[PDB]
């Protein structure tokens, strides 16, 4: 529960016609992030040095 | 004076290579052309005689 997923816009697609190359570009963008309320709530175990 | 327009010559397209297929060169080269003019004029011919 200590972690949230702030997000502005979802996964959106956009197509563009580039006659100068006859290629049809496709663009997919989104804005997200992973944030926690406080500075705790996670532990990781790691191999010995 | 009378001025007349002259249409220019012909251009030529290009064979685009397969390597430049995805780039901007796929559109080929640019063909240009400027018009031209020609002028006409006259002269006066005269003669006289008396009695």
**Which of B16, B26, B29, B30 would best serve as a mutation to test chain A binding (most A beta carbons within 10 A)?**
B26
E-strand ranges in chain B read 2-6, 36-40
- Report how this structure was experimentally obtained: cryo-EM
Using DSSP's 3-state secondary structure scheme, residue B20 falls into: helix
Cα(B4)–Cα(B7) distance, integer angstroms: 10
Resolution of the experimental structure, in angstroms = 2.9
Distances (CA, A) of B47 to B41, B44, B50: 21, 10, 11
Segment A26-31 long-range contacts (CB within 8 Å, at least 24 positions apart): A31/A7
Contacts with A, B 1-51, CB within 8 Å? 22-24, 26-27
Provide, as residue numbers in chain B, all residues whose Cβ is less than 8 Å from the Cβ of A17. none
Using DSSP's 3-state secondary structure scheme, residue B27 falls into: helix
């Amino acid at each position: 529960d200590n972690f949230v997923m702030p997000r502005q816009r979802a996964v959106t697609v956009e197509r563009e016609r580039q006659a100068g190359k006859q290629r049809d570009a496709y663009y997919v963008t989104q804005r997200v992030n992973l944030q926690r309320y406080f500075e705790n709530g996670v532990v990781s175990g790691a191999y010995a040095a | 004076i009378l001025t007349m327009l002259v249409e220019p010559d012909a251009g030529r397209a290009t064979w685009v290579a397969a390597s430049a297929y995805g780039s901007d060169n796929t559109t080929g080269s640019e063909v240009t052309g400027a018009l031209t003019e020609i002028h006409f004029s006259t002269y006066k011919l005269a003669a006289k005689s008396f009695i």
